């Protein structure tokens, strides 16, 4: 009847991550502002190290004609861009590293496994820094949309608006990966509960350093649009266009590789160099043609 007894808490994972987990402001001019700034939109972002290079949403900085980021210890600085990402949706961010800064626990070595516990940090209808609970749900989720197909982590921890570019993580505090999208389509006119979408931590990490090193993402482009493979189109002008390539062909192996997924191939494609050539297997009538082709870069979005 009495207690001496300890409750059930995830304080901890909160203690070690919420501290790295910042509140991000994007602020725009108006018409209307007449020379003030205004929110134009709200989120969150994940303080990776302590460089000051933060990660958030893109859809969350665009079109920003300045940026806010807020810690929970008070501290306030004027956000510097250091690349976007429409593909991933990402974004990163720099700010003044004097004095200390929080980071959030990162481990490579971890592999998330549906049915982790797991807790979103972030800033929902701008109340303050909010942590909510839920599980993994699923994992490698193409999203709400089929069409360019993406990996993602999907949670039942219930996320909102402003939660955007805000940490997931588990109980031992570890980044699971960054809440981004809302499941919102409704079958039949009923509300969707407890569906939501974060990034892959490690796909965070890799997209990050990118953006780091470079203004931004560099991929593949083979200009090719198809389905589990035969060529759906052709792009004008593309890279397979200036190789002549035709429609309406079936691709056995690409790069000496078998191309059985187009999202593996695909994936594979984007990782080489823009300019670089290889060998590219398609049948035609029925015959196993191998015309060669030099990559380009990925068009700008």
Do not use: W
Request: hydrophobic share 40%; net charge negative.
């Amino acid at each position: 009847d009495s207690t001496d007894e300890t409750p059930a808490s995830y304080n901890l994972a909160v203690r070690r991550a919420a501290p790295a987990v910042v509140n991000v402001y994007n602020r725009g001019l108006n018409t209307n502002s007449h020379n003030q700034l205004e929110i134009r939109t709200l989120g969150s972002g994940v303080i990776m190290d302590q460089r000051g290079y933060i990660i958030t949403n893109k859809h969350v900085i665009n079109d920003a004609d300045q940026i806010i980021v807020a810690l929970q210890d008070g501290r306030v600085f004027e956000a510097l861009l250091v690349g976007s990402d429409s593909l991933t949706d990402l974004a990163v961010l720099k700010i003044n590293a004097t004095g200390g800064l929080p980071t959030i626990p990162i481990n490579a070595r971890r592999v998330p496994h549906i049915g982790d516990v797991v807790l979103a940090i972030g800033n929902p209808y701008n109340l303050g820094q909010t942590i909510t609970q839920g599980i993994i749900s699923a994992t490698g989720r193409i999203g709400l949309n089929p069409t360019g197909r993406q990996n993602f982590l999907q949670t039942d921890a219930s996320i909102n608006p402003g939660n955007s570019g805000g940490a997931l993580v588990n109980s031992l505090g570890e980044l699971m990966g960054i809440n981004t999208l809302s499941f919102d389509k409704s079958n039949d006119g009923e509300t969707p509960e407890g569906i939501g979408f974060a990034i892959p931590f490690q796909l965070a990490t890799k997209i990050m350093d990118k953006l780091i090193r470079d203004g931004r993402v560099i991929r593949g482009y083979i200009g090719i649009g198809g389905r589990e493979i035969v060529v759906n189109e052709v792009s004008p002008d593309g890279p397979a266009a200036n190789a002549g390539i035709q429609v309406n062909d079936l691709i056995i192996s690409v790069d000496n590789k078998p191309a059985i997924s187009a999202l593996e191939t695909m994936a594979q494609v984007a990782e080489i160099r823009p300019g670089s050539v290889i060998p590219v297997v398609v049948m035609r009538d029925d015959k196993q043609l191998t015309l060669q082709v030099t990559i380009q870069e990925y068009p700008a979005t």
